[PDB]
Amino acid sequence: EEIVIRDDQDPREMYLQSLFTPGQFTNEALCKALQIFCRGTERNLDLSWSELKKEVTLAVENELQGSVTEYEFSQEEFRNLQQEFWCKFYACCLQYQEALSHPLALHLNPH
Amino acid sequence: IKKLVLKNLNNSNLFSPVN
């Protein structure tokens, strides 16, 4: 539900590892988080992993750029805003991975 | 005329009805 990030680490690296690590998430969860975080119209996001990372990071960068309202700021305030705007994406992916992990039946082959 | 002149700038939309 939350990621530990050290003070020798960039928060964008840690979240872009976890979001794209094999079998944490589905493309079906990530694309739903992306469509709704972008507050979008009906984009059919038929994307690969190496396409999808770019639209995900650029969506977070456009929202983060949308938050810097003054002309002078600290590297501490930047790392805090970076970590908020990534957690705010990650928890959205997790809620769409819940809603796609939910169980509907068993299937068995006796052959 | 044998001479050729490229002019991409203004063309007529081939795929389209005429105004």
């Binding site: 690969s48 190496s50 082959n109 | -």
Partner: protein, 331 residues
């Protein structure tokens, strides 16, 4: 390391970058691997362990499991609990850090996974003491395909210590031609010299063939072809005095006729006419004189100073009597 290989992504490598790498790997005779072309219509990135399963390990695991079948194959059913457990168990054995077949590293090299192949060899090297020559050779293949080719030569000179020990190195040296007269290291050095000329890094062809001449101290056949190859690469560039010595080491007294016939032409056609004159060479004193005399007796006397060149040559070769006859014919 098996967690990391099961999480680490394979690269989106182009077909152009794969068919070129395959035509750089056939240079070693290693591979019936033409089947790699059949399946790359995939809609997803794989991990380096998934890539290894689909294009190598599954082909071996299913050969092994049906090698000695406990009932006729038209009467064996598939039992999922025994099948999946045995397939994953043999994939773990084919990923084990001490496995002497090198097939995982060969899959990464064959599929151009040359960053992940440095990081995997580096996570392995401080504590595993198996496949060490195979790992320095395949790290040398990384350093070639990243352009770090002088590190690659040192990694091949390291891996050369371990030929005659590791099935991948002792596989790399194999042939259908049966003149088993050379050393396993000279077979390995030829396989790497083929690669360095098929890439075209002539420094490393010159340096490695010099390092091969010490482990090739008798054979005469391979000495004559390798020294002809050193002579050629020096002369292709401009190393006319290094070409010279690599050539005077040629034991094949027929090749030392033809190698001069390249050198004298290339020195004339670069106008490097002093290199051509001081020149101790061995053997072909008569043939150079016959080429200059036949050229002098065919050309116009006021267009090319061939008689004064031939005089200067006969004087400097302390043959004043032939210098005199040449100047008298000229007058």
């Amino acid at each position: 390391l098996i967690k990391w290989g099961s999480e680490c992504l394979a690269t989106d490598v182009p077909l152009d970058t794969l068919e070129s790498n395959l035509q750089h790997l056939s240079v070693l005779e290693l591979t019936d691997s033409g089947a790699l072309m059949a399946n790359r219509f995939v809609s997803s990135p794989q991990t380096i362990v998934e890539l290894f399963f689909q294009e190598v390990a599954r082909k071996h695991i299913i050969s092994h499991l049906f090698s000695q079948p406990k009932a006729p194959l038209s009467q064996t059913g598939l039992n999922w609990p025994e099948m999946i457990t045995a397939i994953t168990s043999y994939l773990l054995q084919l990923l084990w850090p001490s496995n002497p077949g090198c097939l995982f590293l060969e899959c990464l090299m064959g599929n151009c996974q040359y960053v992940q192949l440095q990081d995997y060899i580096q996570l392995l090297h401080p504590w595993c003491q198996v496949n060490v020559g195979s790992c320095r050779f395949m790290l040398g293949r990384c350093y070639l395909v990243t352009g770090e080719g002088q590190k690659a030569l040192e990694c091949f000179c390291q891996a050369a210590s371990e030929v005659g020990k590791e099935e991948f190195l002792d596989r790399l040296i194999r042939s259908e031609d049966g003149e088993i007269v050379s050393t396993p290291r000279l077979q390995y050095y030829d396989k790497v010299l083929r690669l360095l000329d098929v890439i075209g890094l002539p420094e490393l062809v010159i340096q490695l063939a010099t390092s091969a001449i010490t482990e090739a101290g008798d054979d005469w056949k391979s000495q004559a072809t390798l020294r002809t190859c050193i002579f050629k690469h020096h002369l292709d560039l401009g190393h006319n005095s290094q070409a010279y010595e690599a050539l005077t080491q040629i034991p094949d007294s027929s090749r030392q006729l033809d190698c001069l016939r390249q050198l004298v032409v290339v020195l004339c056609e670069r106008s490097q006419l002093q290199d051509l004159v001081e020149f101790p060479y061995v053997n072909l004193h008569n043939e150079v004189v016959g080429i200059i005399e036949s050229r002098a007796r065919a050309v116009d006397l006021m267009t090319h100073n061939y008689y004064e060149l031939l005089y200067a040559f006969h004087i400097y070769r302390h043959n004043y009597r032939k210098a005199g006859t040449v100047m008298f014919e000229y007058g």
